[PDB]
Amino acid sequence: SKKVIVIAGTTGVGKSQLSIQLAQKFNGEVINSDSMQVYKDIPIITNKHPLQEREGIPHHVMNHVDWSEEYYSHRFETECMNAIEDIHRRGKIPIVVGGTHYYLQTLFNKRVDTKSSERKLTRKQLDILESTDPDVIYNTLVKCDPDIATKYHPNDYRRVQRMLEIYYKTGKKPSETFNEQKITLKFDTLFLWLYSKPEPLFQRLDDRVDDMLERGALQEIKQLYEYYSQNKFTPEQCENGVWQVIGFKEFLPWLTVKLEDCIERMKTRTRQYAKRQVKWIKKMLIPDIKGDIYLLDATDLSQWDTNASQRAIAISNDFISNRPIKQERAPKALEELLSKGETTMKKLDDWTHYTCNVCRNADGKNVVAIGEKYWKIHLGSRRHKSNLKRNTRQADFEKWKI
Amino acid sequence: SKKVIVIAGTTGVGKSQLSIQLAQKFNGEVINSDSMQVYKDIPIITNKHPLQEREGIPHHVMNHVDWSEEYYSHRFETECMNAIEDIHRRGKIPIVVGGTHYYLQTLFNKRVDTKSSERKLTRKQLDILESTDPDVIYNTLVKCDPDIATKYHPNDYRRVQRMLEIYYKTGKKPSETFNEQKITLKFDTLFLWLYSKPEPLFQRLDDRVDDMLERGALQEIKQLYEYYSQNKFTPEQCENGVWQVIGFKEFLPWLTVKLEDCIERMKTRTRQYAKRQVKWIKKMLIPDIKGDIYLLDATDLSQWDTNASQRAIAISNDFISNRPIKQERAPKALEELLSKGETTMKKLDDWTHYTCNVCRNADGKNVVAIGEKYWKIHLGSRRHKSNLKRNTRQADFEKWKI
RNA sequence: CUCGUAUGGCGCAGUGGUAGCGCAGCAGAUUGCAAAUCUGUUGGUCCUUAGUUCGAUCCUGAGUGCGAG
RNA sequence: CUCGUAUGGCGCAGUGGUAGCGCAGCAGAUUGCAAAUCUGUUGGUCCUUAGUUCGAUCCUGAGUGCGAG
Ligand SMILES: CC(C)=CCSP(=O)(O)OP(=O)(O)O
Ligand SMILES: [Mg+2]
Ligand SMILES: [Mg+2]
Ligand SMILES: [Mg+2]
Ligand SMILES: [Mg+2]
Ligand SMILES: [Mg+2]
Ligand SMILES: [Mg+2]
Ligand SMILES: [Mg+2]
Ligand SMILES: [Mg+2]
Ligand SMILES: [Mg+2]
Ligand SMILES: [Mg+2]
Ligand SMILES: [Mg+2]
Ligand SMILES: [Mg+2]
Ligand SMILES: [Mg+2]
Ligand SMILES: [Mg+2]
Ligand SMILES: [Zn+2]
Ligand SMILES: [Zn+2]
Fold first, then answer.
1. Cβ atoms within 10 Å, residue B387
2. H or E segment at A219?
3. Which residues does the UniProt site feature Interaction with substrate tRNA point to (chains A, B)?
4. Under an 8 A CB cutoff, do A344 and B322 touch?
5. Residues B288 and B327 in one domain
């Protein structure tokens, strides 16, 4: 049927560069899937692929959102799908490329449509949602459909809230809506994972951050700060839209010697991001797609042409030719990445909540662990231990008094 | 979503016995998928699972067809699906078990519906189909939609004919109908493959055949011969319906010392069938389902409980719990069976036809190889070689002639 | 002691100029027959020996084996 | 040669009773914020030694290493 190639991988592995090659070779168009690259201008830090390097290959869902609006999942689902539709009804083959692997879920119905299902929210319902208290909205969820409330920590406000918002707009238990999902991906899809040992990658990521300021990153940072300013924006705004990007908020303290620390801070966010990306691909993506993915070793750039270009084209050629791929699916060196142990095996299955009666966090609430495995980890943590000593020792102060 | 478990494997690995265990443990019903077990009575040779061993677990699409009719794919698709539907809308979980892995294709839309698409066949069209000549129907196909005619050898009458039958009833090139298929399987399916080293299996299959006659196989063979007889049936009828079963046609020459040979002949058909089954599962099934299947070593029956029962239950448990399976998917010992080399790698990709001008078969036609790889195999075969000698040697009796 | 045969795993062809097939085996195929069907293909040097002959697996003799006497 | 400072990977607190805060690191989560966000967590015995005292990282006195006229 209608083929669709998707290139995934950590930041700085050459996804875009590969996307182009495949686009030319197989007549296709790029469909960005980068939560930040969808914003107007701000190319250097948001690291967009320069036009003079796109070989004229069309790109969609990229650099079209104004800093005034906030992009998101469903905004990507409609935009991404339209592109797919279009590129298909033109004899071309779509190639979605981005580091926001989360959005990929749209490729296999992994979401809830609360839009088409309109429903006037009640004063009562709203008052609960937009409530000042944190644990109030949770207890509400725990009440109506506790099976979903047990999969979310009572502090995960964003999500716990989301779940409740669904229980209302759909009037259907979210836990049930999930047991009735398909997850089957539409369109014959070919997932390509361009990997690279962390050590080498990190080094490149650090230099790429350096020569990124040399190309005039600060000019963009200040511009961003201009709009940021004269708009009475607080640093706590850096959790919405473009303000989330890795390249602005890091220098905020500099924009009120010191600039260096804001750079090292950026080098850290990027490094962390890269690490989190692999985690998602190994614990979220792969498991979801039953593990139908092919790896591409991009650790030794001196190579690339052999390990990436060719291998990709090889797989892609058979894929597009509506034939079963004969490729090894994973080069010996990275063969372990697709193993169950490194993937589905790490996924949390125990959800029973536990509440420590002796430990409590800065927010005053008592510690709550999820899953017996981690519940024990806590019990044996120096945190819990130390807390259990002051407690015992205190209890004794009286025993001795008698 | 709606779960559906499928137990596959060669004949005599214990599929049915396992199907029951899983049925009980997980509240489900069996849906037979054995092209022969769907016929009335004739249990011993058709090897049906005895009632006193089904723990009351309901069975569908099994032993309901009269020897007068001929079962087939679409007959299975409607029957199988109805059972799935029903079993589901009752809180139960279906468990399709059978050795006719071919039918399984219904689990992932791998067929063409020429029924719902009625179309009065033309005298001209029919005269081509039901034509006495063999290569006439082929050349017709080669004309209208040669892309499909190039994937079938000009001697594969059954199929070449079928393809043409589709081009008519649907008025759509079959080659195109395939490039427009989905193949995506409906229902969240869990494929279990119960394997067993050939050597041990064969030994059991042989004894299985022996003690099969001891339980009164001949009684069924004669009964079958009764209906067969007084019906003026010729041995060439053993290509339709029940008459295909392995246990009847083998003794036909005995039914007109000798009975022994008819038994050894049966022991051979069974052995061969088992070999062919694995081939289908490794070159057809697995590749089609992108390799989402779990192996179960059933070579050492002394075990079974550990390697089969438990492992299956383990995987099944997580499956049904709508959770990502953490099981290894393949026990070290059989780990190689799921490798690409043993699977998709063996699939024929070269379809260009080749015709040897010096070699010809008993039917008078010239040899026709498919795929350069096999085209060469022929060119170097002693057949071709020997034929090229008589040719050359004869030509030399011409140069000398002048 | 009459006579007949003796060919790749089995069952068979054939030929005076160094051999074919069926089955098994191995392999490819499979979108209404699938426990069925189609396709390709690896195995011998024609029991041993001494002769006839330009040359024998196919002729003569003998031995060895097997078969109906 | 007289003063300072030496505490988990880096940076810095600190009470007489057997140690912290920040950066990182590690891990779990993710179905309208995901370059985001929530959650859990490993690390050192406080530069070595002799005293002092019931007790020392912190108190006294040496020795080691770095900074300063
Ligand atoms: C007699 C023949 C050729 C096939 C039927 S055996 P089976 O596949 O039904 O037996 P199991 O379920 O594997 O025990
Ligand atoms: Mg590169
Ligand atoms: Mg890029
Ligand atoms: Mg703007
Ligand atoms: Mg989404
Ligand atoms: Mg991390
Ligand atoms: Mg059975
Ligand atoms: Mg075979
Ligand atoms: Mg058993
Ligand atoms: Mg031959
Ligand atoms: Mg013989
Ligand atoms: Mg002579
Ligand atoms: Mg001789
Ligand atoms: Mg931290
Ligand atoms: Mg001391
Ligand atoms: Zn605690
Ligand atoms: Zn030839």
1. 16
2. helix A217-228
3. 100, 181
4. no
5. yes
Contact B40, B68 (CB under 8 A): no
> Could you tell me how many residues make up chain A?
402
Q: At what angle do helices B311-320 and B15-25 cross, to 10 degrees?
A: 50
Closest ligand 1 atom, residue B194 Cα: 13
Residues B190 and B282 in one domain: yes
Do B10 and B66 lie in one domain? The reply is yes
CB B108 within 8 A of CB B186: yes
Residue B351 CA, distance from chain mean position: 22
- 166-185 on B, CB < 7 Å from strand C: 166, 178, 181
Q: Indicate yes or no: CB of B292 within 8 angstroms of CB of A290.
A: yes
**What angle, 0 to 180 degrees and rounded to 10, lies between the N-to-C axes of helices A198-213 and A259-280?**
140
Ligand 1 in reach of B102 Cβ (< 6 A)? no
Is there a contact between B29 and B95 (Cβ–Cβ < 8 Å)? yes
What backbone phi and psi angles, to 5 degrees, belong to B354?
A: -135, 140
Question: Distance between CA atoms of B40 and A310, rounded to whole angstroms?
Answer: 56
Residues of B5-38 as b/e, b for ≥16 C-beta within 10 angstroms?
Answer: bbbbbbbbbbbbbbbbbbbeebebbbbbbbbbbb
B178 with B41, same domain?
no
Residue B16 counted as an annotated binding residue: yes
- Residue A35: how many other CB atoms lie within 10 Å: 21
The CA distances from residue A334 to A286, A296, A394, B336, in Å, are: 15, 9, 54, 18
